[PDB]
Protein backbone atom coordinates (compact mmCIF):
# COMPACT_ATOMS: atom_id res chain seq x y z
CA UNK A 1 0.00 0.00 0.00
CA UNK A 2 2.89 2.38 0.60
CA UNK A 3 1.99 4.25 3.80
CA UNK A 4 2.01 8.08 3.69
CA UNK A 5 5.27 9.94 4.03
CA UNK A 6 4.73 11.25 7.54
CA UNK A 7 5.23 7.73 8.96
CA UNK A 8 9.00 7.74 8.24
CA UNK A 9 10.00 11.40 8.16
CA UNK A 10 12.39 11.82 11.09
CA UNK A 11 15.75 10.25 11.93
CA UNK A 12 16.35 7.43 14.33
CA UNK A 13 19.57 7.65 16.31
CA UNK A 14 21.22 4.71 14.53
CA UNK A 15 21.19 3.67 10.89
CA UNK A 16 19.97 0.18 9.94
CA UNK A 17 22.01 -0.88 6.90
CA UNK A 18 21.61 -3.91 4.69
CA UNK A 19 24.32 -6.27 5.85
CA UNK A 20 24.43 -10.03 6.61
CA UNK A 21 22.17 -9.82 9.66
CA UNK A 22 19.34 -8.46 7.51
CA UNK A 23 19.25 -10.24 4.12
CA UNK A 24 15.61 -9.67 3.11
CA UNK A 25 15.83 -6.16 1.71
CA UNK A 26 14.22 -4.84 -1.50
CA UNK A 27 16.27 -3.28 -4.27
CA UNK A 28 16.86 0.47 -4.59
CA UNK A 29 14.61 2.38 -6.97
CA UNK A 30 17.18 4.92 -8.15
CA UNK A 31 20.04 3.27 -10.04
CA UNK A 32 21.57 6.22 -11.95
CA UNK A 33 23.40 9.01 -10.16
CA UNK A 34 25.38 10.74 -12.95
CA UNK A 35 23.65 12.24 -15.98
CA UNK A 36 24.41 14.68 -18.76
CA UNK A 37 27.60 14.59 -20.78
CA UNK A 38 29.59 13.22 -17.82
CA UNK A 39 32.93 12.93 -19.68
CA UNK A 40 33.57 16.64 -20.26
CA UNK A 41 36.83 18.17 -19.15
CA UNK A 42 37.34 20.03 -15.91
CA UNK A 43 37.91 23.35 -17.69
CA UNK A 44 34.71 23.08 -19.74
CA UNK A 45 32.06 23.46 -16.99
CA UNK A 46 33.21 26.16 -14.54
CA UNK A 47 29.93 26.94 -12.77
CA UNK A 48 28.39 25.01 -9.85
CA UNK A 49 24.83 25.21 -8.51
CA UNK A 50 23.71 23.25 -5.42
CA UNK A 51 20.53 22.38 -3.54
CA UNK A 52 21.15 22.54 0.22
CA UNK A 53 19.16 20.92 3.04
CA UNK A 54 17.51 22.85 5.89
CA UNK A 55 16.26 19.77 7.76
CA UNK A 56 17.24 16.58 9.53
CA UNK A 57 15.20 13.84 7.91
CA UNK A 58 14.90 10.80 5.67
CA UNK A 59 14.69 11.09 1.88
CA UNK A 60 12.72 8.28 0.27
CA UNK A 61 14.18 6.37 -2.66
CA UNK A 62 10.99 7.20 -4.59
CA UNK A 63 11.45 10.95 -4.05
CA UNK A 64 15.04 10.83 -5.31
CA UNK A 65 14.02 9.00 -8.48
CA UNK A 66 11.17 11.45 -9.08
CA UNK A 67 13.38 14.54 -8.65
CA UNK A 68 16.07 13.25 -11.02
CA UNK A 69 13.71 12.81 -13.97
CA UNK A 70 12.14 16.21 -13.31
CA UNK A 71 15.48 18.05 -13.39
CA UNK A 72 17.05 16.19 -16.31
CA UNK A 73 14.13 16.82 -18.66
CA UNK A 74 14.26 20.58 -18.08
CA UNK A 75 17.98 20.91 -18.78
CA UNK A 76 17.70 18.87 -21.97
CA UNK A 77 14.91 21.09 -23.29
CA UNK A 78 16.43 24.47 -22.40
CA UNK A 79 20.19 23.90 -22.23
CA UNK A 80 20.96 21.08 -24.66
CA UNK A 81 22.04 17.48 -24.16
CA UNK A 82 25.80 18.10 -24.21
CA UNK A 83 25.87 21.23 -22.04
CA UNK A 84 25.68 20.09 -18.40
CA UNK A 85 26.63 17.37 -15.94
CA UNK A 86 24.21 16.43 -13.15
CA UNK A 87 25.02 14.44 -10.00
CA UNK A 88 22.98 12.91 -7.16
CA UNK A 89 24.93 12.90 -3.89
CA UNK A 90 23.05 10.75 -1.36
CA UNK A 91 22.63 6.95 -1.87
CA UNK A 92 19.85 5.51 0.32
CA UNK A 93 21.65 3.06 2.71
CA UNK A 94 19.00 3.00 5.48
CA UNK A 95 16.30 0.28 5.67
CA UNK A 96 12.72 0.83 6.91
CA UNK A 97 10.53 -1.66 8.79
CA UNK A 98 6.84 -2.52 9.12
CA UNK A 99 4.93 -4.49 11.77
CA UNK A 100 2.21 -5.87 9.46
CA UNK A 101 -0.94 -6.52 11.49
CA UNK A 102 -3.10 -8.44 9.00
CA UNK A 103 -7.23 -11.62 14.32
CA UNK A 104 -3.51 -11.31 14.85
CA UNK A 105 -1.04 -11.17 17.76
CA UNK A 106 -1.05 -7.38 18.40
CA UNK A 107 1.93 -5.78 20.12
CA UNK A 108 3.27 -9.27 20.98
CA UNK A 109 6.40 -9.90 18.90
CA UNK A 110 6.47 -6.52 17.16
CA UNK A 111 10.00 -6.18 15.72
CA UNK A 112 9.23 -5.54 12.06
CA UNK A 113 10.35 -6.62 8.60
CA UNK A 114 12.06 -4.72 5.74
CA UNK A 115 9.81 -2.26 3.93
CA UNK A 116 11.80 0.24 1.85
CA UNK A 117 14.94 2.36 1.61
CA UNK A 118 15.85 5.98 2.30
CA UNK A 119 18.85 8.30 2.59
CA UNK A 120 19.64 10.18 5.81
CA UNK A 121 20.23 13.94 5.59
CA UNK A 122 21.48 16.66 7.96
CA UNK A 123 21.52 20.48 8.13
CA UNK A 124 23.51 22.16 5.31
CA UNK A 125 24.12 18.98 3.29
CA UNK A 126 23.95 19.12 -0.54
CA UNK A 127 21.48 16.89 -2.36
CA UNK A 128 21.75 17.72 -6.08
CA UNK A 129 24.54 19.49 -7.97
CA UNK A 130 24.94 20.76 -11.54
CA UNK A 131 28.02 22.02 -13.39
CA UNK A 132 27.58 23.89 -16.67
CA UNK A 133 28.70 26.95 -18.64
CA UNK A 134 28.40 30.53 -17.43
CA UNK A 135 25.60 31.34 -19.91
CA UNK A 136 23.21 28.54 -18.93
CA UNK A 137 23.04 29.86 -15.38
CA UNK A 138 19.33 30.67 -15.23
CA UNK A 139 18.47 27.29 -16.74
CA UNK A 140 20.19 25.48 -13.87
CA UNK A 141 18.56 27.64 -11.19
CA UNK A 142 15.15 26.89 -12.72
CA UNK A 143 15.68 23.14 -13.05
CA UNK A 144 16.55 22.71 -9.38
CA UNK A 145 13.59 24.84 -8.25
CA UNK A 146 11.19 22.44 -9.96
CA UNK A 147 12.88 19.42 -8.39
CA UNK A 148 12.67 20.45 -4.73
CA UNK A 149 8.89 20.44 -4.99
CA UNK A 150 9.42 16.65 -4.78
CA UNK A 151 11.09 16.82 -1.37
CA UNK A 152 9.57 17.39 2.07
CA UNK A 153 10.51 20.37 4.20
CA UNK A 154 12.70 23.32 3.27
CA UNK A 155 15.70 23.49 0.94
CA UNK A 156 17.78 26.33 -0.51
CA UNK A 157 19.44 26.91 -3.88
CA UNK A 158 22.87 28.55 -4.00
CA UNK A 159 25.32 29.47 -6.72
CA UNK A 160 28.75 28.53 -5.39
CA UNK A 161 32.21 30.03 -5.87
CA UNK A 162 34.03 26.70 -6.22
CA UNK A 163 35.34 25.39 -9.53
CA UNK A 164 33.04 22.68 -10.86
CA UNK A 165 33.28 19.31 -9.14
CA UNK A 166 36.87 19.84 -7.94
CA UNK A 167 36.10 20.94 -4.35
CA UNK A 168 38.45 23.89 -4.71
CA UNK A 169 37.92 27.64 -4.75
CA UNK A 170 37.75 29.34 -8.13
CA UNK A 171 40.75 31.62 -7.58
CA UNK A 172 43.04 28.99 -6.07
CA UNK A 173 42.39 26.65 -9.00
CA UNK A 174 43.14 29.47 -11.42
CA UNK A 175 46.57 30.52 -10.18
CA UNK A 176 47.67 26.89 -10.00
CA UNK A 177 46.54 26.38 -13.60
CA UNK A 178 48.78 29.21 -14.81
CA UNK A 179 51.87 27.83 -13.06
CA UNK A 180 51.42 24.52 -14.88
CA UNK A 181 50.69 22.47 -11.76
CA UNK A 182 47.39 20.89 -12.85
CA UNK A 183 47.37 17.71 -14.94
CA UNK A 184 44.12 17.66 -16.92
CA UNK A 185 43.11 14.34 -18.43
CA UNK A 186 39.72 13.38 -19.77
CA UNK A 187 37.23 13.80 -16.95
CA UNK A 188 39.53 14.29 -13.94
CA UNK A 189 42.47 16.38 -12.75
CA UNK A 190 45.47 16.21 -10.41
CA UNK A 191 47.80 18.57 -8.55
CA UNK A 192 51.61 18.48 -8.49
CA UNK A 193 53.35 19.01 -5.14
CA UNK A 194 56.97 19.68 -4.23
CA UNK A 195 57.43 16.52 -2.20
CA UNK A 196 59.06 13.54 -3.88
CA UNK A 197 62.04 12.68 -6.02
CA UNK A 198 63.30 15.56 -8.12
CA UNK A 199 63.37 13.30 -11.19
CA UNK A 200 59.79 12.12 -10.69
CA UNK A 201 58.76 15.73 -10.11
CA UNK A 202 59.99 16.86 -13.54
CA UNK A 203 58.24 14.19 -15.58
CA UNK A 204 55.00 15.50 -14.08
CA UNK A 205 55.80 18.94 -15.46
CA UNK A 206 56.13 17.36 -18.90
CA UNK A 207 52.76 15.62 -18.60
CA UNK A 208 51.10 18.83 -17.40
CA UNK A 209 52.37 20.68 -20.48
CA UNK A 210 50.95 18.18 -23.01
CA UNK A 211 48.21 15.98 -21.50
CA UNK B 1 -0.15 -11.41 35.58
CA UNK B 2 2.14 -8.93 33.78
CA UNK B 3 4.08 -6.34 35.88
CA UNK B 4 7.42 -4.50 36.03
CA UNK B 5 10.67 -6.45 35.84
CA UNK B 6 13.57 -4.49 37.31
CA UNK B 7 14.72 -1.09 38.52
CA UNK B 8 17.74 0.48 40.23
CA UNK B 9 15.76 3.53 41.34
CA UNK B 10 16.33 4.49 45.01
CA UNK B 11 19.12 1.94 45.46
CA UNK B 12 21.94 4.52 45.66
CA UNK B 13 20.05 6.35 48.41
CA UNK B 14 19.80 3.12 50.46
CA UNK B 15 23.47 2.16 49.95
CA UNK B 16 24.67 5.63 51.09
CA UNK B 17 22.83 5.90 54.43
CA UNK B 18 25.35 5.67 57.24
CA UNK B 19 28.21 6.07 54.76
CA UNK B 20 29.87 3.28 52.81
CA UNK B 21 32.45 2.06 55.30
CA UNK B 22 35.83 0.36 54.88
CA UNK B 23 37.06 -2.40 57.20
CA UNK B 24 40.68 -2.54 58.36
CA UNK B 25 43.39 -4.71 56.87
CA UNK B 26 44.44 -7.69 59.01
CA UNK B 27 47.63 -7.89 61.09
CA UNK B 28 49.53 -10.61 59.15
CA UNK B 29 48.84 -13.19 61.84
CA UNK B 30 45.42 -13.66 60.22
CA UNK B 31 46.50 -14.58 56.68
CA UNK B 32 46.24 -18.27 55.77
CA UNK B 33 47.97 -20.44 53.21
CA UNK B 34 51.41 -18.85 53.43
CA UNK B 35 54.44 -20.42 51.74
CA UNK B 36 57.03 -22.28 53.87
CA UNK B 37 59.79 -19.86 52.81
CA UNK B 38 57.88 -17.01 54.46
CA UNK B 39 57.02 -19.09 57.53
CA UNK B 40 60.76 -19.25 58.21
CA UNK B 41 61.31 -15.47 58.29
CA UNK B 42 57.93 -14.74 59.86
CA UNK B 43 59.21 -12.25 62.43
CA UNK B 44 60.66 -9.74 59.96
CA UNK B 45 58.02 -10.27 57.28
CA UNK B 46 55.35 -9.02 59.66
CA UNK B 47 57.40 -5.87 60.14
CA UNK B 48 57.06 -5.02 56.45
CA UNK B 49 53.29 -5.53 56.35
CA UNK B 50 52.40 -4.16 59.79
CA UNK B 51 54.43 -0.98 59.18
CA UNK B 52 52.93 -0.34 55.73
CA UNK B 53 49.22 -0.78 56.44
CA UNK B 54 49.54 1.20 59.69
CA UNK B 55 52.12 3.82 58.63
Amino acid sequence: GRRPGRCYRYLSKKAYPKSRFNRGVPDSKIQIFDLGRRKAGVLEFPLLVNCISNERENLSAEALEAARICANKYMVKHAGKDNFHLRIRVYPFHVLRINKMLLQTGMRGSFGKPYGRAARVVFNQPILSIRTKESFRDAAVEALRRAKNKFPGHQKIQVSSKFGFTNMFSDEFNKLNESGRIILRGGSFSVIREKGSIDKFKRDLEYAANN
Amino acid sequence: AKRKNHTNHNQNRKDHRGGIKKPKMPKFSEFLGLHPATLARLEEAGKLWNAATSR
Partner: protein, 159 residues
Amino acid sequence: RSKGYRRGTRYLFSQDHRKHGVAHVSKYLEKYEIGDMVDILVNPAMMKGMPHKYYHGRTGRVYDVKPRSLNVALYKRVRGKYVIKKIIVRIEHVRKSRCSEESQKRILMAAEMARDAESRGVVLAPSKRKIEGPRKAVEVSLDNNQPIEVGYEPHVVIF
Protein backbone atom coordinates in the same frame (compact mmCIF):
# COMPACT_ATOMS: atom_id res chain seq x y z
CA ARG C 1 24.46 -11.13 28.90
CA SER C 2 25.07 -14.79 29.73
CA LYS C 3 27.45 -15.25 32.65
CA GLY C 4 30.50 -17.26 31.72
CA TYR C 5 33.83 -16.34 33.26
CA ARG C 6 35.06 -14.22 30.30
CA ARG C 7 31.65 -12.55 29.82
CA GLY C 8 31.56 -9.46 27.65
CA THR C 9 35.28 -8.78 27.12
CA ARG C 10 35.63 -8.16 23.35
CA TYR C 11 37.27 -4.73 23.72
CA LEU C 12 38.68 -4.95 27.25
CA PHE C 13 40.93 -8.01 26.60
CA SER C 14 42.54 -6.98 23.31
CA GLN C 15 45.96 -5.94 22.07
CA ASP C 16 46.50 -2.35 20.95
CA HIS C 17 47.67 -2.08 17.32
CA ARG C 18 51.30 -3.05 16.58
CA LYS C 19 51.74 -4.22 20.16
CA HIS C 20 51.01 -7.92 19.70
CA GLY C 21 53.13 -10.82 20.94
CA VAL C 22 54.08 -12.44 24.24
CA ALA C 23 55.62 -10.82 27.32
CA HIS C 24 59.16 -9.44 27.04
CA VAL C 25 62.05 -10.64 29.18
CA SER C 26 62.34 -7.71 31.61
CA LYS C 27 58.87 -8.67 32.88
CA TYR C 28 60.45 -11.77 34.48
CA LEU C 29 63.41 -9.99 36.09
CA GLU C 30 61.51 -7.65 38.44
CA LYS C 31 61.82 -8.32 42.17
CA TYR C 32 58.69 -8.20 44.33
CA GLU C 33 58.53 -7.89 48.10
CA ILE C 34 55.88 -7.98 50.82
CA GLY C 35 54.24 -4.58 51.18
CA ASP C 36 54.65 -3.28 47.60
CA MET C 37 51.92 -1.62 45.56
CA VAL C 38 51.23 -3.16 42.14
CA ASP C 39 48.92 -2.64 39.18
CA ILE C 40 46.95 -5.52 37.67
CA LEU C 41 46.98 -5.29 33.87
CA VAL C 42 46.01 -8.33 31.80
CA ASN C 43 48.03 -9.47 28.78
CA PRO C 44 45.51 -11.37 26.62
CA ALA C 45 48.22 -13.51 24.99
CA MET C 46 49.14 -15.36 28.22
CA MET C 47 46.39 -17.83 29.13
CA LYS C 48 47.46 -18.92 32.63
CA GLY C 49 47.02 -17.23 35.98
CA MET C 50 44.88 -14.45 34.93
CA PRO C 51 42.37 -12.68 37.18
CA HIS C 52 38.72 -11.78 36.61
CA LYS C 53 37.92 -8.71 34.50
CA TYR C 54 36.72 -6.79 37.57
CA TYR C 55 40.33 -6.29 38.67
CA HIS C 56 41.85 -5.00 35.41
CA GLY C 57 43.11 -1.52 36.24
CA ARG C 58 43.17 -1.73 40.05
CA THR C 59 46.09 -1.20 42.43
CA GLY C 60 46.84 -3.56 45.31
CA ARG C 61 49.29 -4.43 48.07
CA VAL C 62 51.44 -7.58 48.14
CA TYR C 63 51.22 -9.92 51.14
CA ASP C 64 52.93 -13.08 49.85
CA VAL C 65 55.21 -14.38 47.10
CA LYS C 66 55.10 -17.88 45.57
CA PRO C 67 57.59 -19.48 43.15
CA ARG C 68 55.62 -18.28 40.10
CA SER C 69 52.89 -16.08 41.56
CA LEU C 70 51.82 -13.31 43.95
CA ASN C 71 49.01 -12.74 46.44
CA VAL C 72 47.41 -9.27 46.39
CA ALA C 73 44.88 -7.69 48.77
CA LEU C 74 42.39 -4.99 47.83
CA TYR C 75 38.90 -3.54 48.32
CA LYS C 76 35.64 -4.24 46.48
CA ARG C 77 32.29 -2.46 46.89
CA VAL C 78 29.09 -4.46 47.25
CA ARG C 79 25.98 -2.22 47.62
CA GLY C 80 26.44 -0.47 50.97
CA LYS C 81 29.82 -1.69 52.28
CA TYR C 82 33.37 -2.58 51.24
CA VAL C 83 34.97 -6.01 51.42
CA ILE C 84 38.55 -7.30 51.28
CA LYS C 85 39.44 -9.62 48.40
CA LYS C 86 42.47 -11.86 47.89
CA ILE C 87 43.63 -12.30 44.30
CA ILE C 88 46.17 -14.76 42.87
CA VAL C 89 47.91 -13.43 39.78
CA ARG C 90 50.89 -14.54 37.70
CA ILE C 91 53.92 -12.27 37.27
CA GLU C 92 53.04 -11.52 33.61
CA HIS C 93 49.88 -9.54 34.38
CA VAL C 94 51.54 -7.27 36.98
CA ARG C 95 53.80 -4.23 37.01
CA LYS C 96 55.31 -1.97 39.66
CA SER C 97 53.16 0.99 40.60
CA ARG C 98 54.56 4.53 40.41
CA CYS C 99 51.76 5.85 42.64
CA SER C 100 54.07 6.78 45.54
CA GLU C 101 56.87 8.54 43.63
CA GLU C 102 55.84 12.06 44.67
CA SER C 103 55.33 11.24 48.33
CA GLN C 104 58.61 9.34 48.76
CA LYS C 105 61.10 11.84 47.35
CA ARG C 106 59.47 14.52 49.50
CA ILE C 107 59.64 12.51 52.73
CA LEU C 108 63.23 11.59 51.85
CA MET C 109 64.52 15.17 51.62
CA ALA C 110 62.68 16.01 54.84
CA ALA C 111 64.68 13.47 56.85
CA GLU C 112 67.75 14.50 54.85
CA MET C 113 67.92 18.07 56.16
CA ALA C 114 66.72 16.80 59.54
CA ARG C 115 70.03 14.98 59.88
CA ASP C 116 71.80 18.01 58.41
CA ALA C 117 69.96 20.15 60.98
CA GLU C 118 70.75 18.10 64.08
CA SER C 119 74.38 18.29 62.93
CA ARG C 120 74.00 22.05 63.53
CA GLY C 121 71.38 21.76 66.31
CA VAL C 122 68.77 24.01 64.69
CA VAL C 123 65.96 21.75 63.46
CA LEU C 124 62.25 21.96 62.70
CA ALA C 125 59.78 19.28 61.57
CA PRO C 126 56.78 21.26 60.22
CA SER C 127 57.09 21.46 56.43
CA LYS C 128 53.49 21.07 55.26
CA ARG C 129 52.64 21.85 51.66
CA LYS C 130 50.37 24.79 50.89
CA ILE C 131 47.77 25.23 48.17
CA GLU C 132 48.34 27.85 45.48
CA GLY C 133 47.27 31.26 46.78
CA PRO C 134 45.51 34.32 45.38
CA ARG C 135 48.03 36.23 43.19
CA LYS C 136 51.19 38.21 43.90
CA ALA C 137 51.55 41.44 41.89
CA VAL C 138 52.54 42.53 38.38
CA GLU C 139 54.49 45.45 36.91
CA VAL C 140 53.52 45.39 33.22
CA SER C 141 55.51 47.80 31.04
CA LEU C 142 54.83 49.29 27.62
CA ASP C 143 58.22 50.70 26.56
CA ASN C 144 58.20 47.86 24.07
CA ASN C 145 55.19 45.57 23.66
CA GLN C 146 52.75 48.09 22.23
CA PRO C 147 49.02 47.29 22.50
CA ILE C 148 47.18 45.72 19.59
CA GLU C 149 43.67 47.22 19.47
CA VAL C 150 41.10 44.39 19.29
CA GLY C 151 37.32 44.57 18.81
CA TYR C 152 34.03 43.14 17.53
CA GLU C 153 34.84 42.77 13.83
CA PRO C 154 31.80 42.42 11.46
CA HIS C 155 30.60 39.03 10.25
CA VAL C 156 31.48 37.35 6.94
CA VAL C 157 30.23 34.29 5.05
CA ILE C 158 31.64 32.31 2.12
CA PHE C 159 30.00 29.51 0.16
